[PDB]
Write a protein that binds this DNA or RNA. Structure first.
Lengths: 49, 53, 53, 47
DNA sequence: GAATCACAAATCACAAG
DNA sequence: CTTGTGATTTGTGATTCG
DNA sequence: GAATCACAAATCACAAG
DNA sequence: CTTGTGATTTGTGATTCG
């Protein structure tokens, strides 16, 4: 379903890795950040989703 | 950790609802949003893209 | 009002447990901590020091 | 559990300074009391 | 639509007593 | 110490860019 | 959420038939 | 003049870029 977004900070070096890889092999940074976040929450906060 | 001590930030826009969950968890049990982002993304790279670290 | 309009802010200390309650509440529901502290404080002044506002 | 800091409007902060200086007290004291009475008033459940 | 900015909130850590 | 506050970091609506 | 690609389908144009 | 082919031009879903 549709869902709004919220700006957050991430460490520059980690952002770059994702930037280079997504430009190299398709995708965008946001997609990845979302997935990383979800997976972190599934891991540490499984109750919450 | 000289490199890391002067490491700065990029911004990124995540799903609000995923952000809300973190906003409340860190409020309750400490830390903050950026910390969660950093760990979340470090662990993801470590998981799927270890060569890059 | 002139003084509110023009001046900035000033750091202040508070009980951690009371602060925490507001941090959780604002995380869950809308708003931010400062917002609440400024109301708290204004209401304190309008009650115990009415002649100063 | 200790202290946390917060940045309040400087005009309201001034008022408190003047008062705590003139009569007894300190800024933290007022804060603590300001906030405590606010919670009681508006968020009584949270104790 | 993602990506980035710019100014506010929030916290840090030294200063003052 | 405890309290006070300027410096610095973190948060996010606003803006950019195509 | 517009700019710029890419490609095809009109539009052109000259000449042959 | 009428009409087929190839040649610029035009309008467009698709895609790039933030």
């Amino acid at each position: 379903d549709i869902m709004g977004d919220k700006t957050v900070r991430v460490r520059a070096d980690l952002h770059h890795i994702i930037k280079i890889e997504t430009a190299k092999n398709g995708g965008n940074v946001k997609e990845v950040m979302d997935q990383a976040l979800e997976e972190y929450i599934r891991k540490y906060l499984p109750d919450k989703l």
